[PDB]
């Protein structure tokens, strides 16, 4: 699956960086990339994808199960 986080406002870059550092610790094996205000996690299990969405529930996110 794929999770995409979209960060908003004047702090978006710093919040992305915070979330990115956190997720690199949760899943050192996850393929994590970012550009602009979007953070993308690939190679994550669909159930783990709903978990990290639920961990940062106020960050807008999408999940692609395919």
Burial class for 52, CB neighbours closer than 10 Å (0-12, 13-18, 19+): buried
Query: How many Å apart are CA 22 and CA 59, to the nearest integer?
Result: 14
- Tell me how far the alpha carbon of residue 60 is from its chain's centroid: 9
The residue ranges of DSSP E strands in the chain, in sequence order, are 2-6, 31-35, 38-42, 60-64
Helix (H) or strand (E) holding 16: helix 12-26
Resolution of the entry in angstroms:
1.9
DSSP bridge partners of 60: 6
31: left (phi over 0), alpha (psi -120 to 50) or beta: beta
- Tell me how far the alpha carbon of residue 33 is from its chain's centroid: 9
Q: 28: Cβ–Cβ under 8 A, 6 or more apart, which residues?
A: none
User: Hey, what domains does the chain have and what are their CATH numbers?
Assistant: 2-64 (3.30.70)
Longest dimension (CA), the chain: 32
């Amino acid at each position: 699956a794929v999770v995409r986080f979209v960060f908003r406002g004047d702090l978006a870059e710093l919040m992305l960086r915070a979330v990115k550092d956190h997720l690199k610790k949760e899943g050192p094996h996850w393929n994590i990339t970012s550009r602009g205000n979007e953070l993308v996690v690939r190679g994550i299990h669909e159930s783990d994808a709903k978990r990290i969405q639920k961990e940062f529930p106020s960050v807008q996110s999408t999940i692609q199960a395919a």
